[PDB]
């Protein structure tokens, strides 16, 4: 029991490029995609762990 | 003390010259009181400056990052990830460190040269007209008003002028 709860949900993500079609096709257990995004390409970065604030 | 003026025959530096790092002070009859020399001293601070300027701005830094985090199951990579940052952390640390003690020590037999580079003038500009104390002065064996001396400064001093005089009183001592 994790969270309360003895059931999965195992996530997936794929970049769809231009030109491209994705098909989804399923018969249960789907959890549909409802919002995606289109975004542009920021090479050479990171994420930092960080409490500092904002300025 | 390489050249062997700085902590040398001349043990101290002067309190009282804040216009330059180079100076001369002089004790005559019109008065005494200390003098910078420019010449000497402009050369050094736009040098140094310079030196300065040149370790700082040959560090060319790309816009990049460090942070990376790795899944549990890559911990070799995520041990090979830290690798590279010690092995720099490692090299950029030595380099640096040993640099600063080399232009320490270049930095101060560059400043010892200059004080015995003006030794070397006003010595070879009277020549005989005065005997060298070894503390990193002269005794005129002659009288100099403050227009002579003003041209042992300035590196226009007249030997034939003061030159008969010297004689008479070399001759007395």
Redesign the interface.
Known sequence: KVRDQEGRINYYWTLLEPGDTIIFEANGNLIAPRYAFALSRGF??????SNAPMD | GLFGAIAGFIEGGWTGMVDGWYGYHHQNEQGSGYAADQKSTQNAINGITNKVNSVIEKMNTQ???????FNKLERRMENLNKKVDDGFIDIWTYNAELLVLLENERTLDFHDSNVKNLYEKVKSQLKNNAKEIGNGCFEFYHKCNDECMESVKNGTYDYPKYSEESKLNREKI
């Open positions: 050479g970065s990171g994420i930092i762990n | 816009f990049t990052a460090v942070g990376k985090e």
